[PDB]
Amino acid sequence: SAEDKAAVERSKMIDRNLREDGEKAAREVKLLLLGAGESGKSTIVKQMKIIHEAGYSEEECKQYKAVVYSNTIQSIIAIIRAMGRLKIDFGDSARADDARQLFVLAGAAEEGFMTAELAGVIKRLWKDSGVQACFNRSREYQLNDSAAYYLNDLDRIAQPNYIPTQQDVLRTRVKTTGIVETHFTFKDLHFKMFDVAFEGVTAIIFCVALSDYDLVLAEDEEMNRMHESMKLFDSICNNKWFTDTSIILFLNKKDLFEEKIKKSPLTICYPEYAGSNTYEEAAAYIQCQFEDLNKRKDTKEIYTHFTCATDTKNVQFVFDAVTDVIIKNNLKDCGLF
Numbered sequence: 376s377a378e379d380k381a382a383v384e385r386s387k388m389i390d391r392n393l394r395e396d397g398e399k400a401a402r403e404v405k406l407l408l409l410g411a412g413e414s415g416k417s418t419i420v421k422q423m424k425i426i427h428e429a430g431y432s433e434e435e436c437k438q439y440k441a442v443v444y445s446n447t448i449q450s451i452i453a454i455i456r457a458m459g460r461l462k463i464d465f466g467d468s469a470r471a472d473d474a475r476q477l478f479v480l481a482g483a484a485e486e487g488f489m490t491a492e493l494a495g496v497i498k499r500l501w502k503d504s505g506v507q508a509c510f511n512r513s514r515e516y517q518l519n520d521s522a523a524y525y526l527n528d529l530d531r532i533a534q535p536n537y538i539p540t541q542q543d544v545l546r547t548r549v550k551t552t553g554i555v556e557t558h559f560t561f562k563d564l565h566f567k568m569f570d571v572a573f574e575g576v577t578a579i580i581f582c583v584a585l586s587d588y589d590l591v592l593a594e595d596e597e598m599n600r601m602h603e604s605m606k607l608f609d610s611i612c613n614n615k616w617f618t619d620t621s622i623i624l625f626l627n628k629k630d631l632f633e634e635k636i637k638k639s640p641l642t643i644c645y646p647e648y649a650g651s652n653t654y655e656e657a658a659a660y661i662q663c664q665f666e667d668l669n670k671r672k673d674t675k676e677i678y679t680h681f682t683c684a685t686d687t688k689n690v691q692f693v694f695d696a697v698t699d700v701i702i703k704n705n706l707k708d709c710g711l712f
């Protein structure tokens with residue numbers, strides 16, 4: 376049994392015996408978190424802390440509430456502004472005043488905030504048929520993936536005394552810069568996890584936003600996002616430094632993808648795609664497109680997982696499976712400290 380096989384495997388080790396206090400030494404695992412912007416790397420970092428360490432306590436969550444406000448405000452403003460650039464009128468003409476009031480209020484504030492007035496303005500905008508029609512064309516502009524999440528719970532978020540939930544925090548988009556290092560312990564392995572905006576890397580976890588298949592890059596409107604992370608995977612996966620590195624592929628945002636794929640065709644990303652436009656076929660196709668980039672197949676297996684990184688239980692399940700792979704394949708290259 377897959378987990379037993381890992382337990383057996385680790386029990387074959389004898390290097391702890393070479394240390395005076397071998398049995399309480401720390402077995403160290405260096406893990407690199409890679410992927411395009413907004414692919415989910417920071418979200419996975421949060422999930423490690425939630426799952427393996429303290430968590431995100433309530434006072435920690437309160438620190439994020441203006442971030443939630445800011446995310447919500449950015450989201451609605453992006454949709455309203457797109458309406459203009461895409462020539463979508465408001466379903467109810469009275470909403471043009473709310474749109475203005477949105478800019479008046481955001482225009483005079485210093486950071487993310489929420490008042491009854493502003494909640495009222497945004498909830499009326501979000502309920503409008505025209506705004507909804509613009510929302511449903513978001514692949515044509517740039518919009519936070521959490522737009523719907525926050526805006527549908529606007530009422531809860533608007534409450535005075537609102538206290539951000541874990542899911543609220545997980546759903547935030549926080550501007551990360553440079554390299555973030557996080558430490559946690561799981562199955563007696565001491566993970567050092569690096570999120571890059573390396574030598575002796577035990578494992579790489581490469582994140583892909585599946586839901587990007589119909590989106591265009593932020594910098595350049597004429598540049599398919601999925602293709603960019605492919606070009607990046609290619610480079611990473613076949614990199615000489617990583618031959619003995621377990622390469623794990625998180626095909627992430629599977630929940631957004633499952634919703635997109637119904638009404639938006641894969642052919643946008645891969646024009647040659649000739650399979651049915653269903654979750655099953657299009658997901659598989661994407662997986663095959665990436666895994667096929669592995670130029671040294673005979674001697675390098677890629678471990679692919681379909682994840683929803685904001686879903687704590689899914690990440691725990693997945694990271695558990697990823698950990699048995701490291702324990703079965705890389706343990707001999709992991710030092711004791």
Ligand SMILES: Nc1nc2c(ncn2[C@@H]2O[C@H](COP(=O)(O)OP(=O)(O)O)[C@@H](O)[C@H]2O)c(=O)[nH]1
Binds near residue numbers: 545546547629
């Ligand atoms: N619905 C959904 N949202 C996600 C998923 N993974 C990440 N997000 C959201 O996508 C946005 C960007 O994620 P982030 O982890 O910051 O990507 P990063 O730039 O690689 O660090 C955040 O608002 C996340 O909450 C997912 O699997 N499903």
Ligand SMILES: [Cl-]
Binds near residue numbers: 463465
């Ligand atoms: Cl308009």
